[PDB]
Every structure is written in C-alpha cells, then in structure tokens.
Design a protein around this motif. Structure first.
Motif, PDB file in Angstrom:
ATOM      1  N   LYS A 143     -41.714  23.455 -60.735  1.00 55.13           N
ATOM      2  CA  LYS A 143     -41.418  24.784 -61.294  1.00 55.13           C
ATOM      3  C   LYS A 143     -42.592  25.371 -62.085  1.00 55.13           C
ATOM      4  O   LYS A 143     -43.271  24.655 -62.821  1.00 55.13           O
ATOM      5  CB  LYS A 143     -40.194  24.735 -62.210  1.00 55.13           C
ATOM      6  N   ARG A 199     -32.951  34.888 -60.243  1.00 56.79           N
ATOM      7  CA  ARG A 199     -34.359  35.270 -60.169  1.00 56.79           C
ATOM      8  C   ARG A 199     -35.007  34.760 -58.878  1.00 56.79           C
ATOM      9  O   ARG A 199     -34.836  33.602 -58.512  1.00 56.79           O
ATOM     10  CB  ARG A 199     -35.107  34.735 -61.387  1.00 56.79           C
ATOM     11  N   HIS A 231     -30.040  32.841 -66.578  1.00 53.05           N
ATOM     12  CA  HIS A 231     -30.745  33.121 -65.330  1.00 53.05           C
ATOM     13  C   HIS A 231     -31.292  31.846 -64.731  1.00 53.05           C
ATOM     14  O   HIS A 231     -31.617  30.894 -65.450  1.00 53.05           O
ATOM     15  CB  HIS A 231     -31.849  34.192 -65.505  1.00 53.05           C
ATOM     16  N   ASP A 259     -45.271  25.892 -69.151  1.00 54.30           N
ATOM     17  CA  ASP A 259     -43.968  26.256 -68.609  1.00 54.30           C
ATOM     18  C   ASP A 259     -43.701  25.606 -67.249  1.00 54.30           C
ATOM     19  O   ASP A 259     -43.933  26.233 -66.202  1.00 54.30           O
ATOM     20  CB  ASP A 259     -43.882  27.778 -68.493  1.00 54.30           C
ATOM     21  N   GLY A 276     -37.508  30.044 -71.589  1.00 56.86           N
ATOM     22  CA  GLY A 276     -37.828  28.667 -71.253  1.00 56.86           C
ATOM     23  C   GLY A 276     -39.296  28.456 -71.531  1.00 56.86           C
ATOM     24  O   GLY A 276     -39.709  27.394 -71.992  1.00 56.86           O
ATOM     25  N   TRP A 277     -40.087  29.489 -71.260  1.00 56.81           N
ATOM     26  CA  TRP A 277     -41.522  29.430 -71.504  1.00 56.81           C
ATOM     27  C   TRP A 277     -41.733  29.154 -72.995  1.00 56.81           C
ATOM     28  O   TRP A 277     -42.437  28.210 -73.352  1.00 56.81           O
ATOM     29  CB  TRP A 277     -42.225  30.738 -71.077  1.00 56.81           C
ATOM     30  N   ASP A 307     -32.497  31.121 -70.389  1.00 53.35           N
ATOM     31  CA  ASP A 307     -33.254  30.607 -69.265  1.00 53.35           C
ATOM     32  C   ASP A 307     -32.744  29.246 -68.769  1.00 53.35           C
ATOM     33  O   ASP A 307     -32.868  28.257 -69.484  1.00 53.35           O
ATOM     34  CB  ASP A 307     -34.692  30.472 -69.720  1.00 53.35           C
ATOM     35  N   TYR A 312     -32.883  37.469 -75.777  1.00 53.30           N
ATOM     36  CA  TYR A 312     -33.353  36.600 -74.703  1.00 53.30           C
ATOM     37  C   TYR A 312     -33.850  35.296 -75.275  1.00 53.30           C
ATOM     38  O   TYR A 312     -34.571  35.305 -76.270  1.00 53.30           O
ATOM     39  CB  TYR A 312     -34.468  37.267 -73.890  1.00 53.30           C
ATOM     40  N   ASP A 328     -34.032  27.825 -66.051  1.00 56.82           N
ATOM     41  CA  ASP A 328     -35.110  27.372 -65.176  1.00 56.82           C
ATOM     42  C   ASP A 328     -34.640  27.328 -63.713  1.00 56.82           C
ATOM     43  O   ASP A 328     -34.183  28.347 -63.194  1.00 56.82           O
ATOM     44  CB  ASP A 328     -35.635  26.016 -65.644  1.00 56.82           C
TER      45      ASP A 328
HETATM   46 MN   LIG Z   1     -38.859  31.083 -67.707  1.00 54.07          MN
END
Ligand SMILES: [Mn+2]
Lengths: 528, 518
Positions: B203, B242, B194, B113, B97-98, B167, B94, B169
């Motif tokens: 976001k 998501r 995702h 994030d 993005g965080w 990610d 994985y 976002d």
């Molecule tokens: Mn994320």
C-alpha cells in the motif's frame, strides 16, 4: 554453587560502588548501600536507551550551570512538533498538564489533576522518543548515501534531544513511585520532576520527609536499573496553604495554629452547621469568618506576641533566648522551652483550624519553599519552585536562599503561560528574562503549555480562514510559508522517511524494487 | 437462552433488520446477503454504539450537501486541541492514515504511509478525538446551563460533535481483518470510513509511486464485508470507496475480467519471460542498477499493449480485406469480455491467434502491468458504486478538467452518486493553480457532486509550520517570542484555549467534586 552466588554478588556490588563514585553523583546523597541495591536486582542487566539520554542531559545542564546559562524548551504534544523543536532546542519537556487534556492513556481528558492512569506521561515519553530515534536513523541514511563533500547542503538535525518528563506527585505511595520511575526509564526519560503535593488533591502539600522519600525511591529504582536518570524536585510551597499532616518537625515553623481560645474547633462547627440545612457559599463564609477570628499564626510568633503582652520583665531578653533555644525545633520541644521561659503554656491550637479532610493550615510563601528546597537538595539534581507570577525579585530571593546553603544547586524555572507576558512585562525585559534568570543558577527553563497554545492558535487561524476563503487559505497560510522558510515537513514523504524505507526494502530484495514509493511519479517532484 | 421461543426471537429481530434496511439511508445500497444471515451472526446483547449517532448525522449532512451541490470540507486532525478549534468552523473531521503513520502508530514506531502500523492505529486515533469531543460537549452544557437563558447569548456554543471520517487503508488484510477493523472503528467512534483498492503489503500514499491494485472483485468484497459488520452491529456507518487507478501501474492478479481491458501484455514473440531473465541475472550476481536496466529495456522491447489494441494493430498490419469492418465487429463482440473469450473472437475473425503474453512481463512478485488512468478509474468506480456511499479517485494534480471527467464518467451510470475529493498538500498548490482559482476550487468541485472534500495533511503542516516558527524565534529572543508569536495573537483572535484552565474543564470538574462531596 552458592560460592559463585556470593562472588557474583560481591563483584556486582563493587561495580555499583565504582559507578557511584563517578562525578555524576558527587552532589548526591544515597541513604542506602550498594549491597541493598544489588540484592534487589536479578541476573539479566539491561542498559536502557534512556540512560544514554540521561548522560547527555547531565552534561548539558552541568555545562549551563557552570556558565550561568540556561537550556530552555517547552511542553511537546506529539512527534511533528518534536522534529521541529529538535532544530533549535536542546531538550524536550513532556507536560502532565498537556497530557491530561491531550494524551490520557485511557483517552479520557480533563483538567490538570494527575488523575489519568499513570501510564499516561511515560507513554507520551515513549511516543516522542521512538519518533526521535526514527528520524535519527532516517537522517543518517540520507547523509551517508552521498560522499562527505556533498553533505554540506544536507540537514544535520540533532533529533536525540533529552526528554524531561512530568511525574506529578508520583501517583501513589512509594512503590507506585518506583514503578512509575521504572516505566519512565524504559520509555526514554532522561529526567523527571516530582512535586511535593498530595495526590488526589489552595494546594495541599505532604510532609517534608514524605517528598524526600519519593526522591529516594526514584534514585533507588534508577540504581537498580543502572540509569543516570536526573531527578528534579519541585515544591509547591510558594502558594500552598495546606499540609496533609504535621508529623515532620521541619514543617512546624510553617504550620498555622489558632490563638483564639473562645472558638469551637472548625470541623465540629462545620459539621454541626451542615446538618442545619445551611450550605453553599454560606458554609464557606462561616469558615472564612472563623479563620479570620482565629488569628492564625506560627507557634514562635504566638510565643513572641504573648511575651509582648504579658506580665514579664526584660521582654526583649526572654524573646531572644526563646529564639536561641526553640527556633527550628519541633513543636513539642518549643512548647517545653516556652513553658520554662514563661512559667505557663500559652494557648496555641493547630488542630482546631483543620479542614474537613483533616488538612493543617500552612504558612506558604518563599520562606516555606526555601526551607523545603534546602531539605530536598541532596536528594535531587535540580530544584524548582512553582511560581504564581514571573517575579524576578522573588526568583532571586529563592535562588539566594537555596544557594546560601547549597551554592552549587542547579535550579529549574517554569516560564508559565498562565502568566500574561504583557501586563507582567515590557518587551525588552521579556527578551532578556531567561538570560537574567540563568545568571541566578536557573539552568533549565520551560514553557509548560506552549505546545498546546501554538497548536490551538494555528488551528483556529487556519480552520477559520479555510472556512472563509477555502483552498486559498492553505496555500497562503501554510504551504507557501513552509516553502519560503524551508520547513522540513513541506516535502512530507521524504520527511516521513519514504526514501529511508524504500532503501530498506531494496536491501532485502536484491537492490531493486518494483514497488518503490519514491520512484517513478511521486508528486513530491513538484517541490524544489 | 430458553428454546421453545428462540425462533421467535430470531424472527422478530430479522423483521427489525428488514424494517431498518427499508429506510431511505439504504436506497442506493446493494446487500448480497439477507437479514436472516446477519441476525444469525449476532448474539443476545445488542448494542447501539455512540458512533451510530454520528453516522446518522454525517449521512444527514452529506445528503444535504449533495442535494444542493454544495460541499462539507475539512482536514486531517492530529490530536484533541486541534479538534476543539476545528469544531468552530468545520462540520466534520478527517482522521488520516498518512498522519497516523508518522504521528500515531499504536506501537509508537513511526514511518511513511505504507499502512504497516498495527491496524489498531487509526481506530485508536478516532477514539482519541471522539472521547475529547464528548468531553468538551459535556464541559459546555454544564457551563451554559449554570446561567439562566437570558444571559447565555455571549457564551460559547460550539458543536463539538462533528462526525469523524476515518482512513481504513486497504483493510489491513483479508476479509476477516476488514470486518474486525470495521468493528473497531465502529466501537471507537467512526461515522464513516474509507477503503482503497490497493493491495496491503504494498500500500502507498496515493501520491507515492509503486502502487499495486487488487482485482475489482476483491475490493467489492471488502466493501460488502464492511457493510455486513456494520449491519451485524446496527450502525448506519458510511463506507467510502477510494480508487488508486488513475496512476497505478501494477495489478496483484488478473483473475477479474473487468480488469482485462486494462492489463498490458507483451507483443514481442522473440522474448523470454522477464522473470526468467531476472532470475538468471540475480543467480549469477547481478544486482541494483544493472538488474534494473535488464528489466527496463526488456519492457521497452516488449511493446506493451492491451489485447484489444494488439488485435487492432494486427488487423491494421496484416493481409485483411475490410479492415474497418473487422475492427468494428471485434470491438463490439469482445468489449468487456474475459481475455479467453476475446481471444476466441479474434481467432474466429482473423483466422489465427495473434501473439499476446501478459504473464511474460510480470514483476518478480508476480504483479501485472496495468494501463492506469482516469478510464481505468471510472471503470472501477462504476463497479464499486452499489457497495459504497461515496467514491473518490486520487489524482496527480488538482486538475479541474480531470475531476469533471471523472464525475461525468461515474454519473453517466450512477447520476446520484456522492463523490469525495482529496485537496492534497502532496500538490504544490502555488504552481498547480492561481490564487483566484484556489479560492473557488472547492465550490466549483461541489457543482460536480464532490460533496465531501478534505485536506489530508493540514494537521501535520499547520503544526509543523507554527512549531518551526515558534521554536526558532523562541531560541533567539526567548519569552518575547512567546508574547509576540503566540499569546497575544491568541488573546486578539479570542482563542478559547488562552484561558487554559477553563478550556480544559476545570470548572466542569470542580462542580463535579462539589456535587459528590457536599
Ligand atoms: Mn491514507
């Protein structure tokens, strides 16, 4: 209008001379003038952020050397690491080795060969530095939001830990060295180290003057930019066995020649032998057999041996005068001396044992390193001799050798993980090793690859456990120990600056926000 | 290109795409566009991206897991050292993005994030790990083949080619941004990505507050755009949807009727619009807490409710005969209809228009008050399903009952829908759940169809923990800390990396040099 041109020049030259008379530079030899520097400048002077850090690093190392203590650190991979290191270590090291496997500017990894693009290590410096600056802002915002009486329980981490970064051998010729230095200064380096190997390459060294020129190039670029950047000179002479060329007389005492006149030149031989199909470890055995037969030695030893075996009277007398007249002189002058003391030219061929690339054989070891260190000394702020093993006796010897000529010379030391701190040492000696070394003047020390190895270790432990007991491993091996040891990062939204940025956005939008990240039901309220 | 044919090339390539789309990979996939439309967006230099191999492999893995009600599980990876160690035990990777926000922004400016880094950020991280995976795979093949078969038994045989899920976002902008970002991901090495139904610009991490959703149709469009770009490029790239609906309280606009049942309106006809109050308060110098209190009690007085609930409330309280009857008939005829149509039904059934105003409570940005929760999330997920290969709902706690409720909700309509689950370290796991359940949580979730599960931030926290521990000890007992805390556990657990020259590929490259020199 050229009136002004000349006055502006002279005034700026005067400002540079004043700067150069500052105590920062009292051990520094510049083989160029302020006039030459200023005339390389433009008309938009910049005080680089890294300059603040260079000045900070200088005070630290000055402090350590004076008290015969050491600052010590290790190679940092990325910002998470650097925010934790910041709690306990006062400097940061950025490693070329780690960068090669972990941070190439083109994302192509590989072994430590300094063959990534040269943006690589400067980019990593900017990576960490920009993160330091952020967490510094974050923390100032958090501390100032309450009255000073309520700050006692707030973190007070110094994130602005000066970064020292790997410049390899300078990634090309002198103009590359200067551009590389330039990058480093604008990316955030407080100091850089540069080593006397040859790029693209038993280690192969460059002539002494060539490394000196590298150091001068670094200083010059720093001067153009108005930066107090520290320059660290590293020599690989302790284990090196080869030398790119032989034009520097200060090297001649350590260049090995053939004393066997029966041998055909090595290159001519290997060339002929490769044609005959013969190859692999059989060529390598030919080379080894030839080299053994050649009885390699320095010219001075070759002269002494010839004296010991020839028809001469008062042999101790001839030797001591040869030493008196020839040692530390060029080979051309040592030959003339020897011819006049011996009545003939003894046999000594230092071209014959050259490698397929044309590299001369070098008598590496601590003596060679000291000889180089002493010549580098007035052009660098610290000196470092790459070490084969953690040998305290050898570290003492190198330190003494350097200090006999330059007693104030700051030294750096590689506490290397390629060692085996178990077979090399018992536990209480390990615990004192840095401190003992510090007594000798090793005031900045570092474990090049500890960032690599700590990451490798925790990743293997966690992934393994994770794959065996699932989510339990996370609680047991990661989150609960984070909580018990009050690690910063466990409250990761706060740590990452979520509050810092909410407060930013509220400042621009009337003191409130409908979309505040840390309002309402952030799940970080599950953490005390 | 020479004409005369041109159409022939077009029509043969179109057939190839149609043949491709008939593969069982696409059996649950709705495409609202045609092969002819896709091919006419291509050029004449087709490329099979290396990421496609990984996408096919990831697909194969996830098919197997779901079909057996098991799970592949992994966690967020920071950098190449980590990925080479993960590879031994975990069959996917994985990219978070965080984690990228704090540790890998393409501009080096870190932060929380908020997906406000340049959108090159997460694709660059994908490439960072993928180029390393490729390298170590090369390193290992050279190493194993350099000895004869009968003595490879003890050699490392690690699968470094673990498919990466990354990610995206919210897609970093409009649909043309979504497609450009998807294109990057595909050329950088992503096997799957995702994307979530939040608004860009607002976001949040799923476990932050202040989350604003976009209409159901807007997120659908994002998913179709991802698929179109994958189709243009010929990649089997997985798309994961998501939803942040479980805890979101705001909605960017109300244009989509599928949202209307979940939009809260004022039922208090005495109130002026909230924004008009806010504007007057600000215009006369009010700010901060004082300004927030004005909003807070305006919202209290407004008695927020869905329109359906307001109709039922008005029936319960008004002069009506057969109230259970009107409620029955109202619910029936108004369910899933636009607000306009439900208002018409209520007017016809009640003989008058009840008061209801969902403009009035809008935020200063114009956002609507949303009634979030698992029901809102199931609704979104059911709509997203034909356009994604797996679905994920963020939750406030690792709660098995809700995880089951969500799975049942989706599967009631799409029984064969792959689900994904965030094993979130934003949860305090010690307080959320006993250790004996922690050990079985993943297996239990997999029975519900959670066939891909991930600890988003374990990369961050593992690195943070060992770094705090070592740097502290190092600062106090020096090199003893290094032998004790690092080198000897490494030797003891036979970590790869301890022989760092070899691990890094020194033998690989040495052998390369020998090849091009002699
Ligand atoms: Mn994320």
């Amino acid at each position: 209008n050229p009136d002004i041109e000349d006055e502006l020049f002279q005034k700026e030259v005067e400002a540079v001379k004043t700067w150069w008379s500052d105590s920062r530079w009292r051990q520094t030899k510049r083989p160029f003038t302020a006039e030459q520097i200023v005339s390389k400048r433009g008309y938009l002077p910049i005080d680089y952020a890294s300059n603040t850090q260079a000045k900070k690093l200088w005070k630290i190392l000055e402090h350590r050397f004076e008290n015969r203590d050491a600052s010590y650190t290790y190679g940092c991979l990325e910002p998470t690491m650097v925010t934790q290191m910041a709690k306990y270590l006062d400097t940061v090291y950025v490693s070329g080795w780690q960068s090669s496997s972990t941070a190439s500017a083109s994302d192509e990894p590989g072994p430590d060969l300094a063959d990534y693009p040269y943006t690589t290590v400067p980019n990593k410096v900017g990576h960490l530095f920009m993160a330091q600056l952020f967490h510094d802002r974050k923390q100032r915002q958090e501390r100032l939001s309450v009255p000073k009486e309520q700050r006692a329980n707030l973190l007070n981490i110094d994130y602005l830990r000066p970064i020292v970064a790997d410049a390899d051998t300078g990634h090309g010729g002198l103009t590359a060295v200067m551009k590389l230095t330039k990058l480093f200064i604008e990316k955030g380096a407080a100091g850089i180290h540069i080593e006397d190997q040859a790029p693209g390459t038993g280690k192969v060294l460059v002539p002494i003057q060539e490394h000196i020129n590298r150091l001068v190039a670094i200083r010059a670029q720093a001067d153009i930019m108005g930066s107090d950047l520290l320059a660290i000179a590293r020599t690989d002479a302790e284990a090196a066995t080869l030398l790119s060329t032989n034009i520097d007389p200060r090297d001649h005492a350590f260049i090995l020649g053939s004393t066997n006149s029966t041998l055909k030149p090595l290159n001519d031989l290997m060339i002929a032998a490769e044609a005959t199909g013969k190859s692999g470890a059989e060529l390598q055995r030919i080379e080894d057999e030839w080299l053994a037969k050649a009885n390699l030695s320095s010219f001075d030893d070759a002269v002494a041996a010839a004296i010991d075996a020839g028809s001469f009277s008062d042999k101790a007398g001839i030797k001591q005068e040869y030493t008196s007249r020839a040692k530390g002189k060029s080979n051309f002058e040592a030959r003339a001396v020897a011819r006049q003391l011996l009545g003939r030219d003894i046999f000594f061929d230092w071209d014959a044992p050259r490698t397929r690339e044309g590299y001369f054989r070098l008598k590496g070891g601590c003596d060679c390193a000291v000889n180089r260190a002493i010549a580098y000394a007035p052009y660098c702020d610290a000196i470092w001799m790459e070490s084969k093993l953690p040998d305290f006796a050898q570290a003492e010897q190198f330190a003494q050798g350097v200090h006999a000529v330059w007693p104030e010379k700051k030294l750096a030391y590689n506490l290397s993980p390629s060692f085996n701190w178990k077979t090399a040492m018992p536990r209480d000696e390990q615990e004192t090793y840095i401190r003992r070394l510090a007594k000798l003047g090793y005031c900045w020390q570092f474990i090049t690859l500890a960032g690599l190895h700590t990451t490798a270790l925790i990743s293997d432990q966690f992934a393994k456990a994770y794959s065996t007991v699932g989510m339990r491993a996370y609680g047991e091996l990661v989150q609960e120990p984070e909580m018990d040891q009050k690690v910063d990062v466990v409250k990761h939204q706060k740590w990452s600056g979520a509050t810092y940025v909410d407060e930013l956005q509220k400042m621009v939008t009337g003191g409130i926000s409908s979309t505040a990240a840390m309002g309402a039901g952030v799940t970080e309220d599950q953490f005390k």
